[PDB]
Symmetry: D2
Amino acid sequence: CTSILYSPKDHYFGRNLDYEIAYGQKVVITPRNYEFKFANLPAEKSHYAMIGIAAVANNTPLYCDAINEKGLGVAGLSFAGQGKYFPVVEDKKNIASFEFISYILATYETVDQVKENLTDVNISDVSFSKNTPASELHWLVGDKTGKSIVVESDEKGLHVYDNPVNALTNAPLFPQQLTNLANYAAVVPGQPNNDFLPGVDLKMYSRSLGTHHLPGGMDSESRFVKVCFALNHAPKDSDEVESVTNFFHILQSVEQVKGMDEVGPNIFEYTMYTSCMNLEKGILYFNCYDDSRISAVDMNKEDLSSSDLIVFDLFKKQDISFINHHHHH
Amino acid sequence: CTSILYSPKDHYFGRNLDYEIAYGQKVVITPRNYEFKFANLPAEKSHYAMIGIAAVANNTPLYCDAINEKGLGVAGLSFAGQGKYFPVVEDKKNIASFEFISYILATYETVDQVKENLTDVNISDVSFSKNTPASELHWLVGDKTGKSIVVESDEKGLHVYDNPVNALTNAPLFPQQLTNLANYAAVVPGQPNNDFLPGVDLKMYSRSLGTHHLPGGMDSESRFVKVCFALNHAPKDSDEVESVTNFFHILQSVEQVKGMDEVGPNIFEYTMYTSCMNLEKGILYFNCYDDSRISAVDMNKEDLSSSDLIVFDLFKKQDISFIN
Amino acid sequence: CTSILYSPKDHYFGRNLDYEIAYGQKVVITPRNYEFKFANLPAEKSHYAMIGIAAVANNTPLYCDAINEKGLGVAGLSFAGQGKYFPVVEDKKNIASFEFISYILATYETVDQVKENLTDVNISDVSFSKPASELHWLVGDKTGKSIVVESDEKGLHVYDNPVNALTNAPLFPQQLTNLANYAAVVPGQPNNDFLPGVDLKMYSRSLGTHHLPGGMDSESRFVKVCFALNHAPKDSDEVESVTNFFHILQSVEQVKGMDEVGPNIFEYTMYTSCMNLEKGILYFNCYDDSRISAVDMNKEDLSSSDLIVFDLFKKQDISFINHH
Amino acid sequence: CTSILYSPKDHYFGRNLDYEIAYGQKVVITPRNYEFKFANLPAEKSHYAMIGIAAVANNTPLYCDAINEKGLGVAGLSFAGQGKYFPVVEDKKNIASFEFISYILATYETVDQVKENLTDVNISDVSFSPASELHWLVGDKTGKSIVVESDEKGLHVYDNPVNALTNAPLFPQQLTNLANYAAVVPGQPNNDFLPGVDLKMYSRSLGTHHLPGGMDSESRFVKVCFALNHAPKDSDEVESVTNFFHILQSVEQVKGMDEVGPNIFEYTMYTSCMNLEKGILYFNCYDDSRISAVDMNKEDLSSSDLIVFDLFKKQDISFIN
Ligand SMILES: [Mg+2]
Ligand SMILES: [Mg+2]
């Protein structure tokens, strides 16, 4: 998975979800008066409205990534082999991993608040379904200040990191992702000046030889480095549709195509969907592996004082526009 | 630019066109009785119909890439700094660079036929319009056999290469592109076996560490290596919509996003459009940088006995489906 | 800097010291009855004899790397920007950073002993003059195992070292994670699972090492030396072992001009030490002298009380074959 | 193999010989009146003297690399899978591959002269006893070099802008691959990678993080071009020789890293450094790190007998006690 915060003028938050199997994800709006029943926290019957991608089980949204009506966004990203959750304790605020997005977006408005208010939180090992383990995750949190934090629960506890590059993928731990980034400090989008072999005329046979060592792999570090680069150099001061178009192209630059990421014999991890959520406007734009067309759901076109989940299809078939048809005249 | 021939069941031929500025490209069907007038070749008043992406000037299609009604495909890809064209010569068949796609598609049906009949060819330095240079190009040619050839005119003349990887980008010369692939021979889509430090347990902390050195650059070699990999490992035995979807994802893997390939201060080469042509069906599928939705034009729903160019818009605005 | 523990038969411990400034290093033997005076530890007037590379100031050996008569070795390596030292505190055993090699080698015999007894240790911010240099350490012994000792912002950590090598930054767990990025490297030719069904042009020997790092930076040197060490010969006698040891560190040597640390200022491999743990023999050479020199600790009076000092840096010692 | 021409003040020409088996190589001085019996050229009983590394069989120097008394240098480097030799023909000057170094150094003085005189040359398929596939680096005291390659398309002579050579691929392809490393710098790059982001510049020389360290031919070529280009200038004799050995050591092959068969490894067997001005050969080998030196001009160059010294030596340890 790859998640980004993109700040051309408005602010846009979303992710690729890359995996080998779908889990019934949908587009889900949770209105202000849907009652959240948290495993070890008091129920919230009145809260901020939110919109994101979620599975729905027993009338409960299991969010993958979402934003709330105040312009805060949270995305959960696979963290297998690095994450650790901990038993419920009487002296911490226990948030189960599957409810982290819901609780944060129900309650909080800004990244600054989330950072100061995780000091007494424990990410618990509670799962939604009995006899089933919770998925191992870490989180990107971003807001309309254009800044983000990374939240990781690992064997040394809960950590919150300022995110200087507004992107996140999977393993390794976040400080280690930032160290690896500097290994690419010599990369440039155009042609480097020749300080490699001064006095020699190199055969500059292709454009953008400065990106010859930019990573294109499907692994977590390759996708992190490349999406950081694509995000940093993306256009700015763009209006809504141009911004959304640019956002999808950033995440497409680290798309996982079927065949290239083998996780088992003839089993492939691929980009199942891509979400793009406008923090200012409460609009979720999306497409998926089978449908290249971008779709949009505006949370603010619904009744946010209601109490039931509002659900739309996420996964769609290829929506081809047939320019040509039989000539009747 | 990046071009491929994809053979999951039907055969699909097409390309990314990556540049900084558009050249009036549109979807153009040339029907059987449009009269081709060539600089140094007999006129062809009757020929195979074709569909592809072209600029139109003076009622003449200037094709970027196209397929014909018999399932032959030709794509012209930028080859600046490597291509060389030559003055017309009496002892050769002279094809001007800008007419190469039109001529080959009007006249031949198979890759084999093209190879056989290029033996006496000179790619001439003639340009379409007076006082404008011919663009430097090389070409990928593919058909329904699932095989392709690369055609390159350079300082040593004309060369035709069998293409074992069914892909093409820009510089360097094609044998050099092929040698560079061997530099990636240890890449795998999954996890490698640890013969790097035998006896040590490595922390295989991410999926697909076998692709950690797969190139992701915007330069011509990086795109060639990566697209060869994406094409080789793509699904097979797909139906029409699934095959088209997978085709676009293959070329999406080497898409050039604005900002990443700088060809001048604040001037960027990016993926302007993506074409995907079904060789069996004569259907052209396309999208562009500004419109993610795939559009389709079926050549066989037009009147192929006509004599005039049939033209459709290529570049479109983002076509968002508003759900609620 | 690059330090290794090499275990072909006997056990060899040593390092390249890569820097832009020399600081008066010599070969120094400290006999058993030289009195160590530490800043916050009891004085040691009787202890283990050691041999290594040190600067001598105020009749006091400031070791860079050394081994003791029992076959324990400690090498200090630059850790700038990562190390953190702490004020002396009453609840801990405080070892100053510049005393670490002297104290550990004076007092302990094995890596296991060093590990057990670091549990209450604080690396103090005490200098030798009036600032200490930021360091971390490799500790190895004749079991063929080694540990890494790092004091950082989270305090003191001791890591088992599965690869028996150490360079500079980043923190040791990050160095291990980065190794997995090279899991597909092999010394020979990889099998082609990159483009199955395509015959690649395997044009050079050892294409499996095409992505092996050759940079002068800390991570590149770490990855490469781990590879060279892991694949080096075994079952060798003394001279063959020493020769192979020097070649391993040679594989990651820094040549003047490639590591620019300031305007026309370069970090380069100033010396290379190789110490036989079983035999107490230090072998060395330096940037200006390719010939290997040898000092045997056990050819000295180790019950003595004074430092025994030999020249480290030497001019090129050329054997002139013909004359007149 | 890796060969370089290094021009700090005097000019130094030499190579690493990387292989898995030795072939009786020794240091050989061939004096002016040794009679060269060329395969398909007239014999030469009076010619330039030369010094370098060679096998000797049937009183014949089979040179690997050498320089002559006039400051010309030629190194043969493995080129397996790329080189092609051709049958002896009546209308070309045929030079067998195993005698190319001998003939060039016996006959010519400068790189320009060699270029002019290769126009009608055929590198023939004649073998001394098949012939090993080679290509050649030729350099002189001008500080310039050329690459001589006989392949499928015939004999080619290339100007060498980087004064280095390894093995495959063909030389223009080596130069193309060089440009892939255009972004490498010896120190820290300016931050045009992620402008406005403070990177963790955690190591010195992060500019070289993508510099190749492989044992393969392209890795060694790129690295040695960089090491050679950035080496010190204006050095005196011993300082230059020291720097020269370090340049080649930056691409040396340690036993175990280059597997060419089951427990069979290609490694750096010897390293030669020949001063073009002074006619001195310096050498060491895998088993002896001490540099040895043979001076051609301390011998009788009006002689006719080969003058031979041992090349491979035991590790020459200086015992300080
Ligand atoms: Mg408690
Ligand atoms: Mg003839």
